[PDB]
Write a protein that holds these residues in place. Structure first.
Motif, PDB file in Angstrom:
ATOM      1  N   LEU C 363       0.802  -1.216   0.000  1.00  0.00           N
ATOM      2  CA  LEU C 363       0.000   0.000   0.000  1.00  0.00           C
ATOM      3  C   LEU C 363       0.837   1.269   0.000  1.00  0.00           C
ATOM      4  CD1 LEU C 363      -2.649   1.458   0.106  1.00  0.00           C
ATOM      5  CD2 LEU C 363      -2.710   1.116   2.570  1.00  0.00           C
ATOM      6  N   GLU C 364       1.937   1.294   0.749  1.00  0.00           N
ATOM      7  CA  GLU C 364       2.808   2.462   0.797  1.00  0.00           C
ATOM      8  C   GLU C 364       2.018   3.716   1.161  1.00  0.00           C
ATOM      9  OE1 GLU C 364       5.786   1.679   0.775  1.00  0.00           O
ATOM     10  OE2 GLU C 364       5.448  -0.365   0.051  1.00  0.00           O
ATOM     11  N   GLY C 365       2.349   4.849   0.546  1.00  0.00           N
ATOM     12  CA  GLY C 365       1.736   6.110   0.915  1.00  0.00           C
ATOM     13  C   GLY C 365       0.321   6.277   0.403  1.00  0.00           C
ATOM     14  N   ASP C 366      -0.593   5.438   0.884  1.00  0.00           N
ATOM     15  CA  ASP C 366      -2.006   5.509   0.522  1.00  0.00           C
ATOM     16  C   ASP C 366      -2.224   5.374  -0.981  1.00  0.00           C
ATOM     17  OD1 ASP C 366      -4.647   5.645   1.519  1.00  0.00           O
ATOM     18  OD2 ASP C 366      -4.822   7.730   0.858  1.00  0.00           O
ATOM     19  N   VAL C 367      -1.315   4.695  -1.677  1.00  0.00           N
ATOM     20  CA  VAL C 367      -1.430   4.454  -3.111  1.00  0.00           C
ATOM     21  C   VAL C 367      -0.855   3.072  -3.377  1.00  0.00           C
ATOM     22  CG1 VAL C 367      -0.767   5.164  -5.423  1.00  0.00           C
ATOM     23  CG2 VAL C 367      -1.293   6.888  -3.691  1.00  0.00           C
ATOM     24  N   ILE C 368      -1.705   2.139  -3.810  1.00  0.00           N
ATOM     25  CA  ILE C 368      -1.255   0.768  -4.005  1.00  0.00           C
ATOM     26  C   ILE C 368      -0.146   0.738  -5.041  1.00  0.00           C
ATOM     27  CG2 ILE C 368      -1.948  -1.553  -4.641  1.00  0.00           C
ATOM     28  CD1 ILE C 368      -4.774  -0.846  -3.718  1.00  0.00           C
ATOM     29  N   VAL C 369       0.899  -0.031  -4.752  1.00  0.00           N
ATOM     30  CA  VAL C 369       2.075  -0.132  -5.607  1.00  0.00           C
ATOM     31  C   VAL C 369       2.076  -1.505  -6.258  1.00  0.00           C
ATOM     32  CG1 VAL C 369       4.586  -0.170  -5.681  1.00  0.00           C
ATOM     33  CG2 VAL C 369       3.402   1.518  -4.272  1.00  0.00           C
ATOM     34  N   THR C 370       2.300  -1.534  -7.568  1.00  0.00           N
ATOM     35  CA  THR C 370       2.334  -2.766  -8.342  1.00  0.00           C
ATOM     36  C   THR C 370       3.675  -2.873  -9.049  1.00  0.00           C
ATOM     37  OG1 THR C 370       1.268  -1.632 -10.196  1.00  0.00           O
ATOM     38  CG2 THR C 370      -0.148  -2.849  -8.682  1.00  0.00           C
ATOM     39  N   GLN C 371       4.312  -4.033  -8.937  1.00  0.00           N
ATOM     40  CA  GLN C 371       5.531  -4.335  -9.670  1.00  0.00           C
ATOM     41  C   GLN C 371       5.203  -5.354 -10.750  1.00  0.00           C
ATOM     42  OE1 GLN C 371       8.316  -5.954  -6.866  1.00  0.00           O
ATOM     43  NE2 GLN C 371       7.376  -7.990  -6.846  1.00  0.00           N
ATOM     44  N   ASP C 372       5.627  -5.075 -11.977  1.00  0.00           N
ATOM     45  CA  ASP C 372       5.291  -5.914 -13.119  1.00  0.00           C
ATOM     46  C   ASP C 372       6.360  -6.982 -13.296  1.00  0.00           C
ATOM     47  OD1 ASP C 372       3.187  -3.942 -13.697  1.00  0.00           O
ATOM     48  OD2 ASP C 372       4.840  -2.715 -14.455  1.00  0.00           O
ATOM     49  N   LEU C 373       5.969  -8.247 -13.146  1.00  0.00           N
ATOM     50  CA  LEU C 373       6.903  -9.333 -13.417  1.00  0.00           C
ATOM     51  C   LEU C 373       7.147  -9.488 -14.910  1.00  0.00           C
ATOM     52  CD1 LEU C 373       5.684 -12.009 -10.865  1.00  0.00           C
ATOM     53  CD2 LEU C 373       7.281 -10.127 -10.548  1.00  0.00           C
ATOM     54  N   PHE C 374       6.087  -9.449 -15.712  1.00  0.00           N
ATOM     55  CA  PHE C 374       6.199  -9.581 -17.158  1.00  0.00           C
ATOM     56  C   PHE C 374       5.485  -8.419 -17.827  1.00  0.00           C
ATOM     57  CE2 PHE C 374       7.665 -13.804 -18.833  1.00  0.00           C
ATOM     58  CZ  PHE C 374       8.297 -14.183 -17.674  1.00  0.00           C
ATOM     59  N   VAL C 375       6.111  -7.846 -18.851  1.00  0.00           N
ATOM     60  CA  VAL C 375       5.502  -6.760 -19.610  1.00  0.00           C
ATOM     61  C   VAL C 375       5.749  -6.996 -21.092  1.00  0.00           C
ATOM     62  CG1 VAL C 375       5.464  -4.994 -17.834  1.00  0.00           C
ATOM     63  CG2 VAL C 375       7.564  -5.414 -19.112  1.00  0.00           C
ATOM     64  N   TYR C 376       4.733  -6.725 -21.904  1.00  0.00           N
ATOM     65  CA  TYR C 376       4.830  -6.872 -23.350  1.00  0.00           C
ATOM     66  C   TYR C 376       5.302  -5.550 -23.940  1.00  0.00           C
ATOM     67  CZ  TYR C 376       3.695  -8.364 -28.077  1.00  0.00           C
ATOM     68  OH  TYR C 376       3.764  -8.715 -29.404  1.00  0.00           O
ATOM     69  N   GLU C 377       6.516  -5.541 -24.480  1.00  0.00           N
ATOM     70  CA  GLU C 377       7.085  -4.361 -25.113  1.00  0.00           C
ATOM     71  C   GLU C 377       6.821  -4.438 -26.609  1.00  0.00           C
ATOM     72  OE1 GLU C 377       8.012  -1.934 -23.575  1.00  0.00           O
ATOM     73  OE2 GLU C 377       8.797  -2.521 -21.612  1.00  0.00           O
ATOM     74  N   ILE C 378       6.168  -3.411 -27.143  1.00  0.00           N
ATOM     75  CA  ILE C 378       5.874  -3.324 -28.568  1.00  0.00           C
ATOM     76  C   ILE C 378       7.061  -2.678 -29.267  1.00  0.00           C
ATOM     77  CG2 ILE C 378       4.439  -2.198 -30.293  1.00  0.00           C
ATOM     78  CD1 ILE C 378       2.116  -2.455 -28.204  1.00  0.00           C
ATOM     79  N   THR C 379       7.600  -3.358 -30.275  1.00  0.00           N
ATOM     80  CA  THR C 379       8.743  -2.861 -31.028  1.00  0.00           C
ATOM     81  C   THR C 379       8.362  -2.283 -32.380  1.00  0.00           C
ATOM     82  OG1 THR C 379       9.172  -5.031 -32.019  1.00  0.00           O
ATOM     83  CG2 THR C 379      10.225  -4.545 -29.905  1.00  0.00           C
ATOM     84  N   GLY C 380       7.537  -2.982 -33.145  1.00  0.00           N
ATOM     85  CA  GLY C 380       7.159  -2.496 -34.454  1.00  0.00           C
ATOM     86  C   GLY C 380       6.042  -3.328 -35.038  1.00  0.00           C
ATOM     87  N   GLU C 381       5.794  -3.110 -36.328  1.00  0.00           N
ATOM     88  CA  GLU C 381       4.752  -3.827 -37.046  1.00  0.00           C
ATOM     89  C   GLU C 381       5.275  -4.250 -38.409  1.00  0.00           C
ATOM     90  OE1 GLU C 381       4.315  -1.072 -35.380  1.00  0.00           O
ATOM     91  OE2 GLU C 381       3.650   0.603 -36.633  1.00  0.00           O
ATOM     92  N   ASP C 382       4.701  -5.327 -38.934  1.00  0.00           N
ATOM     93  CA  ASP C 382       5.084  -5.832 -40.240  1.00  0.00           C
ATOM     94  C   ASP C 382       4.469  -4.976 -41.344  1.00  0.00           C
ATOM     95  OD1 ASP C 382       6.215  -7.750 -38.674  1.00  0.00           O
ATOM     96  OD2 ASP C 382       4.875  -9.376 -39.290  1.00  0.00           O
ATOM     97  N   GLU C 383       4.952  -5.193 -42.569  1.00  0.00           N
ATOM     98  CA  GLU C 383       4.404  -4.478 -43.716  1.00  0.00           C
ATOM     99  C   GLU C 383       2.937  -4.815 -43.948  1.00  0.00           C
ATOM    100  OE1 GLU C 383       6.611  -6.742 -43.689  1.00  0.00           O
ATOM    101  OE2 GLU C 383       5.990  -8.388 -45.001  1.00  0.00           O
ATOM    102  N   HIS C 384       2.443  -5.905 -43.366  1.00  0.00           N
ATOM    103  CA  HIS C 384       1.026  -6.235 -43.447  1.00  0.00           C
ATOM    104  C   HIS C 384       0.200  -5.496 -42.405  1.00  0.00           C
ATOM    105  CE1 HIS C 384       3.870  -9.676 -43.521  1.00  0.00           C
ATOM    106  NE2 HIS C 384       3.457  -9.805 -44.769  1.00  0.00           N
ATOM    107  N   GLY C 385       0.837  -4.714 -41.535  1.00  0.00           N
ATOM    108  CA  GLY C 385       0.157  -4.050 -40.447  1.00  0.00           C
ATOM    109  C   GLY C 385       0.153  -4.817 -39.144  1.00  0.00           C
ATOM    110  N   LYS C 386       0.552  -6.087 -39.158  1.00  0.00           N
ATOM    111  CA  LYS C 386       0.593  -6.868 -37.931  1.00  0.00           C
ATOM    112  C   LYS C 386       1.599  -6.270 -36.957  1.00  0.00           C
ATOM    113  CE  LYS C 386       0.655 -11.370 -38.527  1.00  0.00           C
ATOM    114  NZ  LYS C 386      -0.758 -11.741 -38.239  1.00  0.00           N
ATOM    115  N   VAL C 387       1.192  -6.156 -35.697  1.00  0.00           N
ATOM    116  CA  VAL C 387       2.041  -5.568 -34.669  1.00  0.00           C
ATOM    117  C   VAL C 387       3.073  -6.590 -34.219  1.00  0.00           C
ATOM    118  CG1 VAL C 387       0.686  -6.243 -32.665  1.00  0.00           C
ATOM    119  CG2 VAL C 387       1.989  -4.110 -32.622  1.00  0.00           C
ATOM    120  N   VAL C 388       4.213  -6.098 -33.738  1.00  0.00           N
ATOM    121  CA  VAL C 388       5.312  -6.944 -33.293  1.00  0.00           C
ATOM    122  C   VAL C 388       5.758  -6.486 -31.913  1.00  0.00           C
ATOM    123  CG1 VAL C 388       7.618  -7.812 -33.782  1.00  0.00           C
ATOM    124  CG2 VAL C 388       6.044  -7.340 -35.662  1.00  0.00           C
ATOM    125  N   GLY C 389       5.955  -7.444 -31.013  1.00  0.00           N
ATOM    126  CA  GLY C 389       6.429  -7.150 -29.677  1.00  0.00           C
ATOM    127  C   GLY C 389       6.925  -8.423 -29.029  1.00  0.00           C
TER     128      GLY C 389
END
Lengths: 422, 250, 422
Positions: C363-389
């Motif tokens: 909880l800390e200073g009256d604001v719940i704190v969340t630590q992310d174990l896994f995060v999806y980082e978006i890097t780019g997209e293909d020429e077809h428009g499909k996203v890449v991450g």
């Protein structure tokens, strides 16, 4: 004069001549033959001289009045008679070419009308009387029948027959009537064939159902469609279609199956497109679901005068479903589910036009941002007073649904139509 | 008769004729003794004869002279508590009777909800008489009615529905001297936040009493030139008459 | 032709000879043997010339029509057929290899179809008819059955059977679909084990329920699970799963059983875990209490776009509960109850991915704190428009739930999986 008096005398004689129960027990053909024989015997005894054709016509009329539906028979048989509305025994209206008119057809008395209505409802097992003054049924031939008994209808029993039209329009007809320019027709074909979550909003008398049917004509035959309708109107020609219809509660308030229940079940019938005849309640929620969870391509009509009004109405609809959904959550649901909104309207001069074909672009903070792919622009009136207007493309090159069109290989036609529509 | 009795100024009469003719959703609210039902009967004379009007009543008081009127009457429950056909059921059936104007003799129950649906699902021109003293009071009464109907509709949803459906509220009230006159002609113009915002077109201003004890007053138009229902008038070409009426009583 | 006539004659003779009530009391084997004996006697009396194989086939068909499921039975026997869809008595579709195909199988009539549907549903004690046209059931072997009666289905009774096909919801599908990297899959397996309280937040179309099923696949068999859902769609394969479902109010607005009621009644059934299909309203409070007061390992989906928004919506939901809890109390409850939040979302190109695997740290200073174990980082997209991450581990080698892992002996697995994310 003479024919009417002869018919009255023949009917009076036959009423006592033959017991009603015995004729009812007999088959239609045997009962009709017996009635014709009795009418001929009465005419011979009554010294009534008439032509063979006149005698046959009188016999047929007597059979209709005793076994059939009396003077309602010629109207029902006629194909152009869309709707029949009987207010009491002395007022019958018909709907021809989309316009109402009065008719000279008149029942002799209210008792005859009540008997005819009772026969019609009992034909599908329903009975209407003072113990059940309200009756609503779907006849086997598809026509819908609504009957109100004298206890409620002060001026006599009320009857309403809405026949099932068999020549429902097609996209070619709509192009012919200039309701949508050919480029709009091609874009609509691409939208329908590419499984775009689609909502057909329309104004009063805007012919939403006809547009929805013309659009469902684009469905891929293999896709397993499911149709929910508060009243059976759509006619899908696809080989694999499941048609469902709600069931209003009886006078006891039991057995109700609202559109929401039908849609919630349809979620489990393994469909590939859920078509809602007309969203009117909270079922919109259960319809917006089945646009997220697969089932891409589900359609649904809606009564609104403009796409923004349609989105507002859908928000209100989901809210009235009893779920504790915040407004932003409902907006996210709408923006993620719907893909195309088509606004069809009936202009001032009675013409029907596809006013808008718009795409739900996204959600900006609190506003559902939409872009209009096709618009109808008016310019005034012609010398005849008809509204003059043309269909214009907004010029967008990559509609948000472009990915769907590319997947099915139709994106070429989409781009061509959106470019040539200028 | 209303014009000659000063119940409504001639410009008010023209505006009411336009409102009735153009299938504008109506709610004729009025207080006790105001003869709101008589006002509703008078209003149902600008309807196009072709339009299929279905009148739901409780005692068959309306005497519409149109040629295609279907008169329905509710059935009160028998002493045993069965056989009841409430006005709500009559309206719900009328939804399936293919009408163009569902006219309710008096809204005093949940039927209002259904009636509003009719007002907002293609049956434009439906009228409903209500028991209220002011247009704002009438709107609040309609909302309370819908809420008491037993549904889970949030108050905001009901207010939005009322704003969308209704388009004109005519307030007929009996003045202190016993005479009855039309006081407000108010459009439900929109919803802001939670509160429904409405604008009056015609308002009755009282100017004391005369020598014989009769109330002295006159109708004045708020001066609005583009009332919300303007589009509807454009639909039937009644734009010119509406503009003339709103201009002649500025 | 001749076989059909012989079958019809034999069926008529059996109906005129054998009373179905007597056979109803007999078991499947005894009833089948009696039917076979009766059919053999009838054939001998009629002296119908047929081979031993032909006679056996006719007897089996008669038994299926009278005792079994009739012409529908062979399709059930086949393994390739995954789903069967009967739209009226006159046509049947089968899903083979993911493709729907029409089949020549035809029922005798709608009456036989209704009888077969009633038998199928009654196999689990349910009944379907005009009174209750809609029926949905889950046969013990995993088959899901949905039946619509004629009064709702215009073209006749509609039946939908979906066989188990168990292996269509598992970590393998998500891993191969790039929804979660293999390291993320192992971390999710660890979290599913060790009874870590979970809240699967997701956006519109994010497939929250599919992810919830995949997560509950890790539940240990001996744990007495209880599932509350607005509409049963979870298909847990554990031996000790109790399935509940809310009920909406009748048309009179009474008799409802909200999810809050089911969750409150869940605490009194001695459940090891509680699974809530989707939290929408005040139930969020009760469910969270269930997490806090033992029952560790519960789960619940929620509509939110990011884990922080998920926490905010949980707070708003609890506040809606009506209790005068101060915001700090609610935040403390959430911090102590929820252990992991999995945010899955649908990206631009319509792909579904687990954007975040995050852990509520404190909880800390009256604001719940969340630590992310896994995060999806978006890097780019293909020429077809499909996203890449790609899924990246935050590198936090000691998640708060680490202790729980150590308790269940999965600490080494967690360390290995999270250390190789790269």
């Amino acid at each position: 004069d003479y024919y009417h008096a002869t018919k009255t005398t023949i009917f009076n004689a036959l009423l006592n001549t033959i017991d009603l129960s015995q004729l009812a027990q007999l088959d239609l053909k045997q009962a009709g033959e017996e009635i014709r024989d009795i009418v001929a015997e009465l005419v011979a005894i009554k010294n009534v001289s008439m032509s063979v054709a006149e005698q046959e016509h009188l016999v047929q009329d007597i059979i209709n009045d005793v076994l059939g539906y009396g003077p309602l028979e010629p109207l029902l048989a006629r194909d152009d008679i869309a709707d029949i509305m009987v207010n009491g025994a002395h007022r019958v209206f018909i709907e021809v070419g989309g316009k109402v008119q009065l008719t000279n057809v008149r029942f002799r008395d209210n008792l005859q009308l009540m008997n005819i209505c009772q026969r019609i409802v009992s034909q599908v097992g329903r009975r209407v009387d003072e113990s059940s003054p309200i009756c609503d049924a779907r006849l086997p031939d598809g026509s819908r029948v609504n009957v109100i008994a004298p206890p409620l209808a002060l001026d006599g029993p009320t009857l309403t027959i809405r026949k099932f039209k068999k020549d429902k329009l097609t996209m070619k007809n709509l192009v012919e009537f200039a309701s949508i320019s050919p480029e709009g027709a091609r874009v609509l074909g691409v939208i329908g064939a590419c499984r775009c979550n689609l909502v057909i909003s329309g104004g009063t008398g805007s012919g939403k159902t006809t547009l929805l049917n013309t659009m469902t004509a684009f469905i891929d035959p293999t896709e397993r469609v499911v149709t929910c309708e508060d009243a059976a109107e759509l006619q899908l020609q696809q080989p694999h279609v499941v048609r469902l219809e709600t069931r209003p509660p009886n006078l006891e308030g039991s057995g109700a199956v609202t559109m929401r229940d039908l849609v919630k079940n349809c979620l489990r019938m393994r469909p590939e497109r859920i078509i809602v005849g007309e969203v009117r309640g909270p079922e919109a929620f259960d319809l917006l679901q089945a646009m997220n969870t697969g089932h891409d391509g589900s359609m649904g009509t809606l009564h609104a005068n403009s796409p923004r009004e349609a989105i507002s109405r859908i928000e209100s609809m989901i809210t009235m479903g009893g779920y504790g959904l915040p407004s932003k959550t409902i907006k996210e649901m709408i923006v993620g589910s719907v893909d195309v909104i088509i606004q069809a309207a009936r202009l001032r001069d009675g013409s029907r036009r596809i006013t808008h074909i718009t795409e739900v672009v996204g959600l900006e903070g609190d506003v559902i941002v939409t872009q209009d792919l096709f618009v109808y622009e008016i310019t005034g009136e012609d010398e005849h007073g008809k509204v003059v207007g043309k269909h214009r493309s907004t010029g967008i090159a990559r509609p948000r649904f472009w990915d769907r069109a590319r997947y099915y290989g139709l994106e070429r036609e989409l781009a061509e139509a959106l470019d040539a529509a200028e």
